[PDB]
């Protein structure tokens, strides 16, 4: 039996469903992540994504910086709080252009029935994400220097 | 065994949500309430271009203007006597 | 670079990149408003010339001044 097969039956769609892409697992983990969830309101997703990057940006600006050889973690603290606020400009300005009239997603599931469209892509959508990326980011940054410093 | 249907206008081209499972909230009762109320005033998109821009400049203009050797080597300034030029200058 | 290598290479480069993006998960959720395309021929023509001239001028200027000084 072939490990690799056409995309959900269709062999004339630009993709190949490998055991990397489609499998018993991976289809369960990626849905567990904040962004891919369909039924939840647009507030709580942005916080769960936004917070996370506040810790991925936090470690960095401590040990490699100019004041690495000394204010080393105060130095690294608000600099992680920054790429947060710029992303918020990037994501608020990303939103400012795109959405003028109604959403646009692959409406159905793998099962193929017409499920309700997500608020991930809408006028009131990316706003609460852009807010989630801020309140998550700014607060989420503070806890990489209440634990490593204070 | 036919992927060609005008009435089925979405299955045809392959707009299949690959890993978009329609599951319930695994997120907690107490914690989801902590972070709805906390992240609901900053929600609006118009308020971000007013807050993030002007308060972000207020973040640069605070930690930017606050001037000694303690944190950077320029507000430190020149801490030795001037060097001699090429055309006998000061 | 912009003077010697021309469009057909770069566009097909982009052509694979635009597939690459559209079937990358998480990144899937972001899509462009303006379709990404290779710079024109005339664009390539100008952009080469510009880089060439700027480099010319700046290089000499640095040389002229630093040597004479």
């Amino acid at each position: 039996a072939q490990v690799i097969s056409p995309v959900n039956g269709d062999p004339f769609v630009g993709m190949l469903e490998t055991p990397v892409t489609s499998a018993p697992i991976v289809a369960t983990y990626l849905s567990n992540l904040p962004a891919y969830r369909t039924g939840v309101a647009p507030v709580l997703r942005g916080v769960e994504i936004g917070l996370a990057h506040g810790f991925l940006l936090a470690g960095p600006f401590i040990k490699l910086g100019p004041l690495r050889n000394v204010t080393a973690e105060i130095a690294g603290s608000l600099s992680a709080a920054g790429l947060v606020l710029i992303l918020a400009l990037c994501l608020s300005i990303y939103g400012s252009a795109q959405f003028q009239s109604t959403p646009s997603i692959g409406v159905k599931t793998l099962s193929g029935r017409s499920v309700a469209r997500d608020p991930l892509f809408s006028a009131d959508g990316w706003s609460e994400f852009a807010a989630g990326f801020l309140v998550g980011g700014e607060a989420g940054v503070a806890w990489a220097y209440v634990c490593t410093q204070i | 065994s036919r992927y060609f249907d005008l009435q089925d206008m979405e299955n045809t081209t392959g707009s299949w949500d690959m890993y978009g499972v329609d599951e319930k909230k695994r997120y907690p009762d107490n914690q989801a309430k902590f972070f709805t109320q906390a992240t609901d005033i900053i929600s609006r998109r118009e308020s971000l271009r007013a807050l993030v821009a002007l308060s972000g400049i207020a973040a640069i203009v605070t930690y930017g203007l606050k001037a000694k050797d303690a944190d950077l080597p320029i507000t430190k300034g020149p801490q030795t006597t001037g060097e001699n030029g090429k055309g006998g200058s000061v | 670079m912009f003077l010697i290598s021309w469009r057909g290479y770069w566009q097909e480069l982009i052509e694979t990149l635009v597939w690459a993006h559209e079937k990358t998960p998480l990144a899937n959720l972001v899509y462009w408003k303006d379709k990404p395309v290779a710079l024109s021929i005339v664009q390539a023509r100008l952009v080469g010339l510009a880089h060439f001239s700027v480099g010319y001028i700046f290089t000499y200027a640095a040389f002229l001044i630093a040597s004479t000084s």
Partner: peptide, 29 residues
């Protein structure tokens, strides 16, 4: 150190920051 502590980082960031922002919105919309 009074003037150039303010005007350099505003011309360095805050002028291009809102310029790249308000010119982006002029292009796409």
């Amino acid at each position: 150190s009074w003037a150039p502590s303010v005007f350099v980082p505003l011309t360095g960031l805050v002028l291009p920051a809102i310029a790249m922002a308000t010119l982006f919105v002029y292009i796409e919309k």
